[PDB]
């Protein structure tokens, strides 16, 4: 039932949703291309016997040497730049658009990016419009042990007081997760017959339809990152105005949100009024180190999406987290202090989802007419 309002606010959304991701201030994603995988070598070393590819379709041995997964997975060259210390990412909401510079700097420097902690060896500015999630062709053993690795380490301080709430939680956000990038392959697949890609029903029966609670994960995923957008919004700054591109970003993205409004957003999402401040912290403490363990994804798209939807995530439970006991006063701050970073991946994330939702209208339609044809 509560499918029912979820994808009633998404419809209406969609469209002005995607526009908006569209946009020059929220098309680009900062990712470092110098991997930190705390296992085998992600960097160089690339990734042998296929312990990175997925049996799937039939063999690849019979299909053309461009429709490989390290070639279905990989950037495109004229879309990214190099990404500088200046980079409007590492900023502050609210160091965006600071009445021209009201915290000086006519002189010296000022390195945001280094400052907030954006240690990046080697980043860059891709183009996410032209670089979409897909079906890569990436999986077999690496995969499996990055989806099992990520699972395994849901554990808790005993002791706690919502000890199983903070597992429960932590575990829906990773399916939801985990079934969103399953059904975005299944829609964006590659039809090795025609080269062109389509909607595959059977692979989404295979990783999605045939298991209801997956689904139901994603609905979970999208009214946290709904609820943590619709928390925030009466308290973003004019971080776009002084932009002449960008101008009305602000406003459009006011658009988007306030027709989220549901009665769902009373429920207590993820526990925040029940989870100790141990718990809050460890379970913030989770999500970080499953954005670190991105890094040892070999398929890059993954990476970059992955990157993306985990840090999304992260950035939603520190939002519901902190504004759940704080005044007015703290609110501004805590959107204020958001980084256009943080923000990007929190509005990607609910784009990722919104698809996602969209995607299981349409392969249900499928699957409804290929029945209905015999
Ligand atoms: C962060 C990350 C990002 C990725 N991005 C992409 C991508 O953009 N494009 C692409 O083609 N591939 C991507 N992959 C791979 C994709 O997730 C699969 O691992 C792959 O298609 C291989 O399928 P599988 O059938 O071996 O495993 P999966 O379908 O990954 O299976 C893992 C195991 O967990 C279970 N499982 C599956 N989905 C769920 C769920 N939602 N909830 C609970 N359990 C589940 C299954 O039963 C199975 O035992 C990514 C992997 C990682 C680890
Ligand atoms: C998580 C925490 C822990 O000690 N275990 C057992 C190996 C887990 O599963």
């Given at each position: 039932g509560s499918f029912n309002e979820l994808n009633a606010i998404n419809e209406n959304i969609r469209d002005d949703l995607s526009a908006l991701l569209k946009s020059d201030f929220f098309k680009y994603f900062r990712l470092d291309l110098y991997k930190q995988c705390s296992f085998w070598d992600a960097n160089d070393g690339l990734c042998?016997?296929?312990?990175?590819?997925?049996?799937?379709?039939?063999?690849?041995?019979?299909?053309?040497?461009?429709?490989?997964?390290?070639?279905?997975?990989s950037f495109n060259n004229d879309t990214m730049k190099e990404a500088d210390d200046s980079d409007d990412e590492c900023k502050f909401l609210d160091q965006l658009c600071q009445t021209s510079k009201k915290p000086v700097d006519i002189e010296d420097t000022i390195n945001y990016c280094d400052v907030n902690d954006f240690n990046g060896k080697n980043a860059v500015l891709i183009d996410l419009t032209a670089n979409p999630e897909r079906f890569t062709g990436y999986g077999g053993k690496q995969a499996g042990q990055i989806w099992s690795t990520i699972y395994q380490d849901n554990c808790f301080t005993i002791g706690e007081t919502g000890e199983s709430l903070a597992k429960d939680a932590f575990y829906?956000?990773?399916?939801?997760?985990?079934?969103?990038?399953?059904?975005?392959?299944?829609?964006?697949?590659?039809?090795?017959?025609?080269?062109?890609?389509?909607?595959?029903?059977?692979?989404?029966?295979?990783?999605?339809?045939?298991?209801?609670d997956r689904v139901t994960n994603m609905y979970f995923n999208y009214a946290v990152v709904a609820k943590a957008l619709w928390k925030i919004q009466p308290y973003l700054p004019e971080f776009s105005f002084?932009?002449?591109?960008?101008?009305?970003?602000?406003?459009?993205?006011?658009?988007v949100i306030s027709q989220l409004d549901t009665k769902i957003f009373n429920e207590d999402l993820v526990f925040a009024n029940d989870l100790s401040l141990?718990?809050?912290?460890?379970?913030?403490?989770?999500?970080?180190?499953?954005?670190?363990?991105?890094?040892?994804?070999?398929?890059?798209?993954?990476?970059?999406?992955?990157?993306?939807?985990?840090?999304?995530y992260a950035t939603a439970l520190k939002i519901l987290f902190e504004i759940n006991?704080?005044?007015?006063?703290?609110?501004?701050?805590?959107?204020?202090?958001?980084?256009?970073?943080?923000?990007?991946?929190?509005?990607?994330?609910?784009?990722?989802?919104?698809?996602?939702?969209?995607?299981?209208?349409?392969?249900?339609?499928?699957?409804?007419?290929?029945?209905?044809?015999?």
């Open positions: 042998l016997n296929r312990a990175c590819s997925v049996d799937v379709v039939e063999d690849w041995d019979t299909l053309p040497e461009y429709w490989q997964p390290e070639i279905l997975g829906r956000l990773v399916s939801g997760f985990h079934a969103s990038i399953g059904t975005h392959l299944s829609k964006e697949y590659l039809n090795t017959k025609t080269g062109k890609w389509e909607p595959n029903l059977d692979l989404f029966m295979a990783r999605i339809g045939n298991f209801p002084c932009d002449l591109v960008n101008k009305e970003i602000k406003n459009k993205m006011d658009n141990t718990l809050k912290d460890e379970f913030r403490s989770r999500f970080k180190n499953v954005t670190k363990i991105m890094d040892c994804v070999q398929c890059d798209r993954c990476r970059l999406w992955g990157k993306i939807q985990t840090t999304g006991d704080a005044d007015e006063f703290t609110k501004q701050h805590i959107v204020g202090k958001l980084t256009k970073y943080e923000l990007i991946a929190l509005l990607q994330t609910f784009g990722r989802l919104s698809e996602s939702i969209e995607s299981v209208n349409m392969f249900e339609k499928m699957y409804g007419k290929r029945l209905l044809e015999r």
